Amino acid sequence: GGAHKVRAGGPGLERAEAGVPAEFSIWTREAGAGGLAIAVEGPSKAEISFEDRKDGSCGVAYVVQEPGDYEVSVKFNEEHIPDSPFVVPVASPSGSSGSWKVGFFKRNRPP
């Protein structure tokens, strides 16, 4: 348990543009130590990066190449946090078949 206490928010959980970094944060202070999993699923393979803010928050950014609908999931100890998975329409800025899912897993350790 503990996923219930985690929150995430940011523009990258609402809308994104192909090739533009889509950003959000995850707040894990009340949840404490446990395993955090962050994944992006959609028609292209995401590149995802993380910044451990050392204050019980995490900065996430992902970039996808192809427009379409993507799901961003955030799980804590293998359970979806509130509002996860987030469905995000990715627009063209102003195709190979199948779908991809790229996930990153790391132990959250409060400082």
Nearest-angstrom CA–CA distance, 40 and 63: 10
- Technique employed here was X-ray
- CA distances to 15, 37, 39, 64 from 6, rounded to whole Å, are 21, 12, 16, 25
Resolution in A: 1.9
The two counts, helices (H) then strands (E), for the chain are 0, 10
Domains observed in the chain: 3-105 (2.60.40.10)
CA 89 to chain centroid? 14
